[PDB]
Design a protein around this ligand. Structure first.
Ligand SMILES: NC(=O)c1ccc[n+]([C@H]2O[C@H](COP(=O)([O-])OP(=O)(O)OC[C@@H]3O[C@H](n4cnc5c(N)ncnc54)[C@@H](O)[C@H]3O)[C@H](O)[C@H]2O)c1
Ligand SMILES: NC(=O)c1ccc[n+]([C@H]2O[C@H](COP(=O)([O-])OP(=O)(O)OC[C@@H]3O[C@H](n4cnc5c(N)ncnc54)[C@@H](O)[C@H]3O)[C@H](O)[C@H]2O)c1
Ligand SMILES: [Mg+2]
Lengths: 371, 469, 101, 51
DNA sequence: CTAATAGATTAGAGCCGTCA
C-alpha cells in the first residue's frame, strides 16, 4: 500500500491532474492515474477497484464543478470510504479544491466533514499544503534519487558619507591669497545675512540668489582645499577632482582607532584616500568619496593609470561593506578637530563647522541574514 | 535621523498563469508563455566554428548544474524548460573560407577592413535568404577571436566605406536592417571557452562554476530571437504609456551633431504587453545641445500618440517620458500643444550621478533592493541594486550607488513613480537575471540609437527589438 | 424542504426511533429514517446527503451512549450543521435525549 | 477600397502591396520563426486579376 | 570674437570582477 490514487473527472480536469501526477512522480512518490497508467484493452472497473482496495495509501480527490456529482468519482469515493473504515485512518481521503466557481456549501455529502486544500490562489501553495500534510502523515516516499528530487523539494540604522554643516558665518559681505576670496564685478566676495541666502528669499539686481549660493559653494570648496593643505595630507590629482591620503609611517603603525589606512599588496602599498565636495541640496552637507591609491615604495606614486587601475581593482575585490564603512569613519574621525566638529577658516575670525560623524538613516525592513 | 520606505517586488507572469519574482525559477517550473514548435538554425563561419557550435548545442540538451544552486538556479536542459526543439539537426551551413578572412584583414585601415569583412559575412546571408528554399529562423554568426580584437573604435593592427563606424557588430547589425533577418553573434572563445588559454594552462575566461548561467542566457536569447515570449509583467496599469529618450552623438558626419531615439511600452487589450521601439532619429545641428527643437518634438509626440491610438483606439490617459537628461521650457511647450486635454504628461529624469552611499552598522552585507529615501515631493533616491533575500546575495560588489529620480515636468506621486520604475527593470530579454539596474525603457532605447548611428540614413527601419538586440 | 430527518445509532435505537417516527407520521409530520424509508439497491451514503441538503426542515438527533460517537451520525450532524449555517436558521438541530448514563 | 478601381493594373498592384507589406513587416520585426507563409486569397481577388 | 576663473550637466571609451 504505497500508491497515491488520484480521482478526477475526465477529460475536463486533465491539465491539473497531469501536472499534479508529474510533480508527485518527480518528487519521488508512486502515483496511479486514470490517464497515465490504465492499460489498453483491460477490464478497467475491476482493475480500478483492485488498485483502490489492495495498494493505496492516499486518495487525493480533485474537487471542482466537474468532479462534483460524477458517477466514477462517486463510486471511487464509496470504495475509498470502505477502505478507510477497514484501515482505521481518519486522513485517508483528501479533497483538493482547484475551481473558484465551486462554493463550499455545495460540496458532496461524502466530503462535507473533510478538510479540503485550496489551490484556487496558487498551485504551488496547494502543492506545499499537500507536501506538509504528507510529511506529517508519513506517506512512504520512495526516494530513489539523490541531488535531484531533494533539489525539487528545495525549489535598521545605516551610516552614510554625508557630513552636515553645523554653522555658517553670519554675513557674506585672488585665488592665491591667504583666505578664500572670489572676484565679482569690481567688488570682492568673501567672509547679506546668510540665513536668508539659504532660503530662496534674497533677490536683487546686484546678484541673484542662485548665483549667491553658487559663490558660497565655491568659497566652501576653496576653504576645504586650504584646510586639508593645512592638515599636511598628501594629495593625488584625479581626472577632474582631487584626493587626499596619508603617508606611510605618519600614523602609529598605520592605524587610527583599530582601523588600518595603509597596508601591503605585493610590490606595492595601498593608501585609503577621500575627496570632498560641498553641496547645498537637499541640505548643506559635505559629500565624501572613497578611493585607493598605490605607491611604489610607500612614498612615491606610480606615474601610470593602467597599473593604478589594475591594482585598485585587485584591492577592492576582498573588501566589503564593513571595511569601507569603518575606513571612511576612521579617516573622518582622524580629521576631527575637538570632539564632534571640524572647522574651516573663512576669515580672520569666522569659521564654518562640519560634523565629524555622518548622517544616520533609519528604516523598518531588513533581512534575517541567512548566513 | 531620516526615514526610508521599502517598495515591494513586482512579480512576473509565466505559463499556466503562475507568478514568481525570479525568471529562472518561473521558466523552470512553469515554462514560457507562447508555444513554438522548434528553432531552425542557420550558421555562417568556418568549419572550426561549425564544430564548436554543434558541440555547444549538444552540450545544453542535458541538465547543467551551477556550483552554488541558491545563488544561481540550475539549467534543466533546453527542451525541459522551453517545450520546443532546438537541436544540431536543423543546421544549414554556409562556409566562409579562412583565406578571405586573412586577405581582407590586411589593409591596415580600420574602416576599409571593417567594411570588407562585414560585406563578406552579410552577402552570403542575403543570398541564402533570397535565392534558396530552406527556412531559417535565427542566423548564428561565429567570428574568430582574431578579427574581434581589430574591429573596434580605437584599434591598430600590431569607396563608400568611410560613412560607417569601424565596429564589426554595429555596422553588421545595421546593414541587415533592410532585409529583416534575426541574428546572434558569438565569439569562438565564448562557446569553446576551455580551448582558449594563457601562459598557464587555464582558460582566459573561467566558466566552470557559472556554466549554467551562460546556458540560461544563451537559451533565453535564442528563444526570444526566434519569435518567443518567455515571460511578461504581471501588473501594468491600464491606459499608461511609457516612453524613453536617449541622445547618441552621430560621430563624424560633416560636423559634431547628435540624434534621439525612443522606446515605448503599454498594456493592450487582451492583457498583452507591447514592448517595441520608436524609430527614426531626430537631430539638431548644435554641438553639445541635448534637446529637441519644437518642430522635431511635435513629430515625436505625434508619432507615439498615433501608435498608441492605432493599437488601442483611444489616447493614453497617462504618458510618462523617462529620460536621463533634463527637459527645458522651449521643447516642453512643443509638448502639450500636440497632446490632447484628456491626457497627463509627466517627465521623469533618472540619473546615477549624485554620490550617496549607505552602510550598515555592525554588518557585512549591503542594503536591501527596495529601499528609497524620499527627499521631497519631486525627488527621491531608489536602490535598484542591493541584497536580495531569495538568492541570498547582492546584485553588485562593494556598496551600490542609488538611482536619483526627479519629477521634472508635470505633477505625479513619487511613490507611484518609483513603483513603476522598479517594475520596468524585469524585462531584460537580452539577459537571464533576477533584475536589472536601470529601467529597460532607457536601456533598449540606447541599443537602437547605437546601431542606427553607425550607417547611412535608412528609411523606415524596423521597430521590433529582435532585429537589434 | 418539509421533511423531518431522524438520525440515530443502528440497530440500538430502532425501537424508540420507530415509535417516534410512527407517532410523528400519525400526527401529520413527514419524517425520514433508514427503516420504512431507505430503498434497497440504492447508493445510500449519497442519498443520506441529498435528503439532508434539499428535503429537510428540521434535524432531530436521538442522543445516547450509542450516539455522539458513531461515524455515520457524526457525518450527518456535520452536513446538518453546514446546512444550518447556509439556511441562517437558529433551530435547525434538535438534540433529543433518551439516555441517562 | 482597392478592388474597385476598374483598372486591372492598379488594383492588382494595390492588393499585392496590401498582402506583401504585412508579410514583410511580420518577417522583419517579430520574434517567431515561420517556415512557410500560407496566403488564403478570397475568390474575388483571384477572379478578376487575370490579364 | 578671443582667453582665463568656477559650478552644474552630459556623452564617449577602456579595464576588471563574477567561487571558495
Ligand atoms: N477521471 C474520470 O472520470 C475517471 C477516473 C477513473 C475511472 N473512470 C471510469 O469512468 C469513465 C467514464 O467515461 P465516460 O463514459 O464518461 O466517457 P468516455 O468513455 O468517452 O471517456 C472516458 C475514458 O474513456 C476510456 N475508456 C472507457 N471505456 C473504455 C474501454 N472499454 N476501453 C478502453 N478505454 C475506455 C478511458 O480512458 C476513460 O477514462 C470510464 O468508464 C472509466 O475510466 C473515470
Ligand atoms: N437516517 C437514518 O435513520 C440512519 C441511521 C443510522 C445510520 N444511517 C446511515 O449510516 C450508516 C453507516 O453508519 P454505521 O456504520 O454506523 O451504520 P451501520 O451500523 O448500519 O453499518 C454497519 C453494518 O453495515 C450494514 N450495512 C452495510 N451496508 C448496508 C446496506 N446497504 N443496507 C443495509 N445494511 C447495510 C448494516 O446493516 C450494519 O450491519 C448507513 O450508511 C446508513 O444507514 C442512517
Ligand atoms: Mg544579444
Amino acid at each position: 500500500r504505497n500508491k497515491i490514487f488520484i480521482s478526477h473527472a475526465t477529460p475536463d480536469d486533465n491539465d491539473f491532474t497531469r501536472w499534479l501526477a508529474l510533480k508527485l512522480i518527480g518528487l519521488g512518490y508512486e502515483v496511479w492515474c486514470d490517464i497515465l497508467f490504465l492499460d489498453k484493452g483491460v477490464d478497467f472497473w475491476s482493475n480500478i477497484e483492485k488498485v483502490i482496495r489492495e495498494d493505496t495509501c492516499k486518495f487525493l480527490l480533485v474537487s471542482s464543478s466537474y468532479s462534483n456529482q460524477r458517477e466514477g468519482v462517486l463510486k471511487e469515493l464509496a470504495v475509498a470510504a470502505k477502505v478507510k473504515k477497514q484501515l482505521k485512518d481518519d486522513k485517508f481521503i483528501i479533497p483538493l479544491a482547484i475551481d473558484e466557481q465551486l462554493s463550499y456549501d455545495d460540496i458532496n455529502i461524502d466530503i462535507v466533514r473533510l478538510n479540503a486544500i485550496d489551490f484556487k490562489m496558487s498551485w504551488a501553495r496547494g502543492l506545499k499544503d499537500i507536501l506538509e500534510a504528507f510529511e506529517k502523515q508519513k506517506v512512504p516516499k520512495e526516494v530513489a534519487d539523490a541531488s535531484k528530487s531533494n533539489l525539487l523539494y528545495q525549489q535598521e540604522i545605516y551610516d552614510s558619507n554625508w557630513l552636515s554643516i553645523l554653522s555658517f558665518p553670519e554675513e557674506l559681505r585672488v585665488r592665491e591669497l591667504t583666505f578664500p576670496a572670489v572676484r565679482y564685478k569690481n567688488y570682492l566676495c568673501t567672509f547679506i545675512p546668510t540665513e536668508e541666502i539659504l532660503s530662496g528669499s534674497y533677490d536683487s539686481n546686484f546678484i541673484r540668489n542662485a548665483e549667491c549660493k553658487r559663490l558660497i559653494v565655491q568659497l566652501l570648496n576653496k576653504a576645504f582645499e586650504l584646510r586639508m593643505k593645512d592638515k599636511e595630507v598628501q594629495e593625488y590629482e584625479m581626472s577632474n577632482k582631487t584626493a587626499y591620503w596619508l603617508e606611510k609611517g605618519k600614523l602609529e603603525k598605520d592605524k587610527f582607532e583599530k582601523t588600518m589606512l595603509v597596508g601591503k599588496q605585493k610590490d606595492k602599498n595601498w593608501h585609503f584616500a577621500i575627496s570632498g565636495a560641498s553641496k547645498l541640496y537637499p541640505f548643506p552637507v559635505l559629500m565624501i568619496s572613497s578611493h585607493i591609491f598605490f605607491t611604489a615604495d610607500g612614498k612615491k606614486l606610480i606615474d601610470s593609470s593602467s597599473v593604478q587601475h589594475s591594482s585598485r581593482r585587485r584591492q577592492g575585490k576582498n573588501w566589503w561593506n564593513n571595511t569601507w564603512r569603518t575606513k571612511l569613519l576612521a579617516f573622518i574621525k582622524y580629521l576631527s578637530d575637538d570632539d564632534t566638529s571640524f572647522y574651516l577658516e573663512m576669515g580672520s575670525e569666522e569659521k564654518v563647522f562640519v560634523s565629524n560623524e555622518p548622517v544616520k538613516f533609519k528604516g523598518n525592513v531588513s533581512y534575517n541574514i541567512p548566513e | 535621523m531620516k526615514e526610508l520606505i521599502y517598495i515591494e517586488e513586482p512579480k512576473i507572469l509565466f505559463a499556466h498563469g503562475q507568478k514568481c519574482t525570479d525568471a529562472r525559477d518561473g521558466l523552470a517550473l512553469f515554462g514560457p508563455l507562447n508555444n513554438l514548435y522548434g528553432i531552425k538554425s542557420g550558421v555562417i563561419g568556418t568549419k572550426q566554428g561549425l564544430k564548436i557550435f554543434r558541440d555547444y548545442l549538444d552540450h545544453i540538451q542535458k541538465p547543467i548544474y551551477n556550483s552554488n544552486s541558491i545563488t544561481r538556479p540550475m539549467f534543466p536542459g533546453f527542451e525541459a524548460v522551453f517545450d520546443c526543439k532546438w537541436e544540431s539537426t536543423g543546421i544549414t551551413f554556409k562556409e566562409v573560407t579562412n583565406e578571405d578572412i586573412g586577405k581582407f584583414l590586411y589593409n591596415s585601415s580600420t574602416h576599409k577592413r571593417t567594411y570588407d569583412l562585414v560585406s563578406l559575412f552579410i552577402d552570403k546571408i542575403i543570398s541564402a535568404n533570397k535565392n534558396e528554399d530552406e527556412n531559417v529562423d535565427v542566423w548564428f554568426v561565429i567570428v574568430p577571436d582574431e578579427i574581434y580584437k581589430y574591429c573596434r573604435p580605437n584599434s591598430v593592427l600590431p569607396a563608400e566605406t568611410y560613412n560607417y563606424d569601424a565596429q564589426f557588430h554595429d555596422q553588421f547589425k545595421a546593414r541587415l536592417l533592410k532585409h529583416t533577418i534575426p541574428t546572434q553573434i558569438f565569439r569562438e572563445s565564448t562557446l569553446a571557452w576551455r580551448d582558449f588559454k594563457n601562459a598557464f594552462g587555464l582558460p582566459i575566461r573561467d566558466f566552470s562554476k557559472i556554466e549554467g548561467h551562460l546556458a540560461w542566457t544563451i537559451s533565453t536569447a535564442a528563444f526570444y530571437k526566434a519569435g518567443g515570449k518567455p515571460w511578461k509583467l504581471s501588473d501594468v496599469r491600464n491606459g499608461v504609456c511609457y516612453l524613453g529618450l536617449v541622445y547618441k552623438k552621430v560621430e563624424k558626419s560633416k560636423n559634431p551633431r547628435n540624434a534621439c531615439c525612443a522606446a515605448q511600452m503599454f498594456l493592450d487589450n487582451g492583457d498583452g504587453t507591447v514592448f517595441k521601439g520608436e524609430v527614426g532619429p531626430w537631430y539638431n545641428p548644435k554641438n553639445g545641445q541635448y534637446h529637441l527643437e519644437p518642430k522635431e518634438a511635435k513629430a515625436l509626440l505625434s508619432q507615439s500618440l498615433q501608435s498608441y491610438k492605432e493599437q488601442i483606439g483611444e489616447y493614453p490617459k497617462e504618458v510618462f517620458i523617462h529620460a536621463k537628461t533634463r527637459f527645458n521650457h522651449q521643447e516642453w511647450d512643443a509638448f502639450l500643444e500636440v497632446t490632447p486635454k484628456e491626457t497627463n504628461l509627466v517627465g521623469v529624469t533618472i540619473s546615477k550621478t549624485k554620490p550617496l552611499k549607505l552602510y550598515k552598522t555592525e554588518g557585512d552585507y549591503t542594503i536591501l533592493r527596495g529601499n528609497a529615501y524620499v527627499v521631497n515631493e519631486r525627488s527621491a533616491f531608489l536602490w535598484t541594486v542591493g541584497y536580495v533575500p531569495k538568492i541570498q546575495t547582492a546584485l553588485s560588489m562593494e556598496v551600490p550607488n542609488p538611482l536619483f529620480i526627479e519629477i521634472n515636468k508635470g505633477e505625479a506621486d513619487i511613490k507611484q513613480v518609483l513603483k513603476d520604475i522598479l517594475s520596468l527593470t524585469k524585462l531584460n530579454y537580452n539577459a537571464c537575471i533576477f533584475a536589472d539596474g536601470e529601467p529597460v525603457t532607457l536601456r533598449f532605447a540606447d541599443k537602437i540609437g547605437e546601431i542606427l548611428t553607425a550607417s547611412t540614413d535608412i528609411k523606415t527601419p524596423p521597430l521590433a527589438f529582435k532585429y537589434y538586440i
